[PDB]
């Protein structure tokens, strides 16, 4: 029911042409952060969305991950945030899906990865492979 609400905010992205408003992302985030007891289901729903959504929503879906993890780290502390560690489990697969996006949108993905590294959102054993993955795509 906390999860139902989050699911409802997340999937209502399909009502909107990106760019998505700050307000909508904040709504999705608050639903996630308020559903923190069920963080595993929240991560699962975000990953499912990223797997299934149309190409135009890949960056929105990544911004959901960004927004949730950065809010959580700020609200609960970097040490204590459950979101980034749980997102880390499947994150390589998650990015494989994110990169089925319009070519014009890859620069946005790399920008978030860069910010994540600078802000130590994920430890470098996570971030660098993801960064490696972006580099490898323009080559092919």
């Amino acid at each position: 029911e906390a999860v139902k609400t989050f699911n409802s905010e997340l999937y209502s992205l399909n009502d909107y042409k990106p760019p998505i408003s700050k307000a909508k992302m904040t709504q999705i985030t608050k639903a996630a952060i308020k559903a923190i007891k069920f963080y595993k289901h929240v991560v699962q729903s975000v990953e499912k969305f990223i797997q299934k959504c149309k190409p135009e929503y890949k960056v929105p879906g990544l911004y959901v991950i960004d927004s949730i993890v950065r809010q959580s780290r700020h609200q609960f502390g970097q040490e204590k945030d459950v979101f980034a560690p749980r997102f880390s489990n499947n994150i390589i697969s998650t990015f494989q899906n994110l990169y089925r996006c319009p070519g014009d949108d890859k620069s946005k993905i790399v920008r978030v990865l860069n910010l994540w590294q600078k802000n130590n959102v994920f430890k470098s054993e996570i971030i660098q492979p993801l960064l490696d993955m972006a580099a490898a795509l323009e080559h092919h």
Binding site: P19, S21, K22, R70
Partner: peptide
Amino acid sequence: YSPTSPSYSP
């Protein structure tokens, strides 16, 4: 949304 936007707090 911007990935540099400030997080919310009291």
